[PDB]
């Protein structure tokens, strides 16, 4: 499974020392490109993309997002006038990209949002822009009259796939790498309750299975997971907690399942 | 790998 995702944001209040327009690209959930309204240029974020792309590619990419920046700049005023709003903090969000699944076939998407709520979504099957809100009917009329659907469905099904197929090939080692996590368990006694915490430090890829084991048997009672949180170097972190009786700290163990480990690693105090 | 047609973002 391989995914390509391009997300854009048009802000009214960023606010101090921050750009109003931010555009970023993703390959299998990894940041590879960045664009901001202050610098006005598309920059590489990973080593595999910069070593495999020329300046002529980035000059072409900069021109595209520069035109997209001015369209989203106009969208902030058009939507404010339509909703009859005067000033304040308003946002325009764009979600575009394609996904390659295990037959499976191709899944393409192009959807927008205003003030964190769904506005419009493109349906490649019917070749029409679906309006989610009653204020999205004037958007549907102007978008379909422009004839964008004819070129957008060809992009999401062929061009988007063609770009993603080579991006995976460029960083095949950078995406297929394995990093072993540093697992450490801790115990803290509160108001007559012993809270045990298990943390995994710097693992790659993102999928991980972390569970608790009391006296050899897996116990999910009073268990809380903080999900998968990213680090500044590309690796991932996870935090799991369990509420137990005081003095029963030695009974509990942390079961960690990852691609880097051939067998599940059991960790104790 | 952005789409050439940036007009598809019009609202």
């Amino acid at each position: 499974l391989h995914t390509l995702r391009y997300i854009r944001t048009a802000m009214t209040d960023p606010g101090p020392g921050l750009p109003w327009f931010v555009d970023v690209g993703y390959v299998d959930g990894e940041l590879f490109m960045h664009y901001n309204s202050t610098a006005r240029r598309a920059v590489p974020r990973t080593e595999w993309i910069a070593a495999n792309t020329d300046q002529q590619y980035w000059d072409r990419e900069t021109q595209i997002v520069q035109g997209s920046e001015q369209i989203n700049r106009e969208n902030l005023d058009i939507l404010r006038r339509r909703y009859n709003q005067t000033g304040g903090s308003h946002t325009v969000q764009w979600m575009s990209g394609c996904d390659i699944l295990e037959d499976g076939t191709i899944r393409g998407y192009h959807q927008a949002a205003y003030d964190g709520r769904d506005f419009v979504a493109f349906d490649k099957g019917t070749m029409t822009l679906t309006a989610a809100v009653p204020e999205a009917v004037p958007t549907k009329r102007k978008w379909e009259e422009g004839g964008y659907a004819e070129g957008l469905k060809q992009y999401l099904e062929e061009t988007c796939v063609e770009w993603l197929r080579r991006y995976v090939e460029y960083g095949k080692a950078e995406l297929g790498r394995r990093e072993r996590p540093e697992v450490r368990v801790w115990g803290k006694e509160a108001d007559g309750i012993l809270t045990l915490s298990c943390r995994a430090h710097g693992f790659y890829p993102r999928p991980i299975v972390v569970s608790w084991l009391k006296d050899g048997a897996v116990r999910g009672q009073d268990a809380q997971s903080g999900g998968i949180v990213p680090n500044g170097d590309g690796t991932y972190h996870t935090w799991v907690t369990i509420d137990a009786q005081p003095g029963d700290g030695d009974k509990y163990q942390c079961r960690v399942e990852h691609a880097s480990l051939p067998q599940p690693g059991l960790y104790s105090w | 790998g952005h789409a050439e047609e940036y007009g598809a973002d019009t609202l």
Binding site: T9, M11, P14, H34, D115, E182, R199, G232 | -
Partner: protein
């Protein structure tokens, strides 16, 4: 308007003398106008790097703040998060042994 979900953690397992990186990740919030600061005993930390700021499938924003540091005994490390959803600055303390 949605409230931010904040988590404070270190890159490597906490140990005095050894170099580490303090992280502060906020997610599930709207609007994107957020103020995140890494602090050492109330004083803002030096050499702090801010994320490019992305958003999830449910349109909710996310930002990560990381800074290179050496954990010292007696010092209290915390993260200050300011948002329009809260009428008070939320302080999330980092525990080296939890």
């Amino acid at each position: 308007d949605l409230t931010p979900k904040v988590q404070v953690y270190s890159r490597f397992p906490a140990s005095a003398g050894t170099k580490n990186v303090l992280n502060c990740f906020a997610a599930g919030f709207h609007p994107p106008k957020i103020s995140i600061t890494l602090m050492k005993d109330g004083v803002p930390m030096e050499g702090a790097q801010y994320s490019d700021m992305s958003f999830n499938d449910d349109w909710t924003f996310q930002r990560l703040v990381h800074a290179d540091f050496t954990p010292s005994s007696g010092s209290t490390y915390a993260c200050k998060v300011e948002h329009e959803t809260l009428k008070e600055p939320q302080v999330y303390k980092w525990d080296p042994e939890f």
